[PDB]
Amino acid sequence: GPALCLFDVDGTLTAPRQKITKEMDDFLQKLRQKIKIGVVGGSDFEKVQEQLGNDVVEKYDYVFPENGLVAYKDGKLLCRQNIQSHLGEALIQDLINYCLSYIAKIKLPKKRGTFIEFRNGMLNVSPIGRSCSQEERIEFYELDKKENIRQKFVADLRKEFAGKGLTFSIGGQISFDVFPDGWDKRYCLRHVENDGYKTIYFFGDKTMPGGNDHEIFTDPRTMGYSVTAPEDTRRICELLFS
């Protein structure tokens, strides 16, 4: 029936760490006369504006920055959500308080700063601290492969907080992430599932496990299409919609 084309932004409509090109922006604006188009990325609205232009809200039918925690539909803000409002201040504080108390008892070679990074969609907890040098990151990534610091911290947090709808995910070199269950790229589906689309195509490049596109690709509500670069996204869209 009526369909929607949802795109990951980085890697799919744009080369990594690069702004959209005038040729792809035009391709999509022409594909917009055929089908309704929308974008989803984990970055704030200011980075989505640096990657797709400061007029993104008027050129895409849907804009879902921050995995859809911020949503725009037809030029207006549809919704706004953040981890503090969903989970409540009490539970937010109980999690921060356990994490600070826990990190204070970890015997590490070095401890720097920003042990807790409050993002609108998650909490990025660092035993060492995100403010550390790159040489200190590596020093902790190797000490963690031996003493399994992040694993034990996440396992004690899973035992104390996870019945409150919380997921814990070790990743990177120095931190793990604490987000409400389902606040990956899948969160954006709840603003398009009620708009009457018989099929919702989705295009992303990190569509294999451990990727930021994987969960939205594996969801039954999407017709997922893995991609490798923006030229490949224009290749598949020509084969699909003429």
Added chain:
Amino acid sequence: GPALCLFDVDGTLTAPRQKITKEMDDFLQKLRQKIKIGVVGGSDFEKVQEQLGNDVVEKYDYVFPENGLVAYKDGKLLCRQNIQSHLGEALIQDLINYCLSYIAKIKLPKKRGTFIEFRNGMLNVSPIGRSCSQEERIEFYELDKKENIRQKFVADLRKEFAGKGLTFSIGGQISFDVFPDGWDKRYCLRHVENDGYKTIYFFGDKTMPGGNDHEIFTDPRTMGYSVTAPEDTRRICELLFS
């Protein structure tokens, strides 16, 4: 012998939270023809550049951002030291671990992120979290006037870490600073002392007990002069050097 004029920036050359006037900026350059001049502030280099010009390192013979933990002389950066190297990783970790366990026990309306911010010449500690929004910032500032949160946290710290060579200072709205003893504005004199000068004048608008210009006004190496605004600094300098 030769002399040097050290100036506070905010409130001494500039008005509160303002750029320098082109009148005062051109007066200081007519004084440089007759005496080497310098500037010193608590702000990062980029904030001193926004107040005095992007070419400050070439308009002034000495430029001492971060109270001198970052120091420029005749355009080139001078040897540098940081809070980790001076205090040691053990005291650092012991202060961080103590501050973290203390913050986990404060009952606040809201807690967010970046409770500890590792800077070159100090550790900034926010009971609420530095990442807090402007609304959450005012909220904690007004509560702390009533409950004296910052005040009690600094009193406990002065006790637990007595004799360890650390000073504590509540400034602003959401935080307090912890710096090595002597790392106030006096730190910068280590780069101008025994450099040929027989007199080192200083000018500051906050030279009273508890101000950021106090210890460098009362330090014996200096010839302190207390000012009220940019126009008063002009008056004293025209009295001394004209």
